[PDB]
Amino acid sequence: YFQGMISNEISKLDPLNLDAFFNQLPSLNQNLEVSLLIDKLREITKSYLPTTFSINDALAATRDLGMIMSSVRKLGIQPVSAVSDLEVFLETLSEITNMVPRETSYHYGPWNPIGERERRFTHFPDERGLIEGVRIAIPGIELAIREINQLSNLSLNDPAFESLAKSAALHVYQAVDGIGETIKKTDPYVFSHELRPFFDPIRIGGKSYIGAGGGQIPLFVVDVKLWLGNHSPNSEYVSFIKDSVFYLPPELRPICVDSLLEPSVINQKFAEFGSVEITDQVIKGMESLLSVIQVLLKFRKPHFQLAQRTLSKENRGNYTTGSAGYTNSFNHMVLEFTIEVEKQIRAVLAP
Ligand code: HEM
Ligand SMILES: N[C@@H](Cc1c[nH]c2ccccc12)C(=O)O
């Protein structure tokens, strides 16, 4: 009962009439023009009644208001503390979106218009590497989620299982396309120095909300359904996912929650494999699961490398963490998790 967060219906809206302002935002930020930032926040709280907004209006308004707030926070000022009327404006908006009162990578990517209206913090072309990265990744991962969700109720011997899993790996490849756009467009040093500071936490109604981040693409939702399940309860990754659930669009929360409380597909299919008549289609089915896992590795291995060149002493600037407060050890932990799964499947397929 959440369906219908359609990206092009949100990307096209300018509910707070900020299109002109966003063409100036990169120069406002370059020149440290905090006063114009505060003015615009003040103007917004007096110019609009957010209770009047449709759901799509509020999503797009969160995107735009969030990025102005992020630009204030960049300089070191908590924007809700400086503009106290924001707090009820952000309360009203999140009642409608049933999402956090802050922009996430959904707002920064798929819900961010292509072309002249594209919302950007800076004039640096490196910023386009992040935006295109998540704009490409997210719709593909979402498609993969719905496909992997259907694997639980299909038999390994059913060729519909193999086809579904193959569609999922192809959809996940969009995350691979996306990090490749980043690697080719975003210099690590420019990231740490020019872009990362727009992704810091903001205090809203007595709680801190992290900035938008690539880690907010719903890839962890693929992981929990596909291989993590309820199998590593006190793990660091489970704690990250736990902290991420209510950042997700509402439509994805049930899938994530159910999956954290259930055996994973691969654990379920490892049992069916070594307990039923192993046929040629059954091997294809099992091989389609290793295909998905191997596509996840084609994202995580170059991601780890880019994060390592960025967080090196040479390039890291004032930061040792991503927006969610972790170092590259966390990326190493997810990649080693995924490598272990690939190892296990290969071992089950060895004869
Ligand atoms: C210079 C660019 C980038 C750097 C330095 C970087 C670094 C990091 C770091 C340090 C984390 C740990 C979590 C955190 O602290 O927030 C993380 C998480 C993550 N980021 Fe990035 N990242 C970059 C670009 C991207 C892009 C463009 C995407 C998506 C298209 C992405 C996808 C992810 C994912 C999925 C995770 C969760 C871990 C996983 O699923 O393997 N990253 N990243
Ligand atoms: N993926 C990293 C770096 C990052 C920060 N903001 C982003 C926006 C888009 C893509 C990646 C990022 C993170 O989640 O912290």
Residue numbers in the entry: -3 to 347
From the reporting publication:
Pyrrolnitrin, a potent antifungal compound originally discovered in Pseudomonas strains, is biosynthesized through a secondary metabolic pathway involving four key enzymes. Central to this process is PrnB, a heme enzyme that catalyzes the complex transformation of 7-Cl-L-tryptophan. While heme enzymes are known for their abilities to catalyze redox reactions, the reaction catalyzed by PrnB is unique and complex, involving C-N bond cleavage, C-N bond formation, C-H bond activation, and decarboxylation.
In all cases, the indole rings of the ligands are oriented perpendicularly to the heme, but the positioning of the amino acid groups varies. This loop closes over the substrate-binding site in the presence of ligands, likely aiding the enzyme in positioning the substrate correctly for efficient catalysis. Another major difference lies in the binding poses of Trp. The difference is primarily attributed to the substitution of Val117 in PfPrnB with Tyr104 in FbPrnB, which reduces the size of the active site pocket and restricts the indole positioning in FbPrnB.
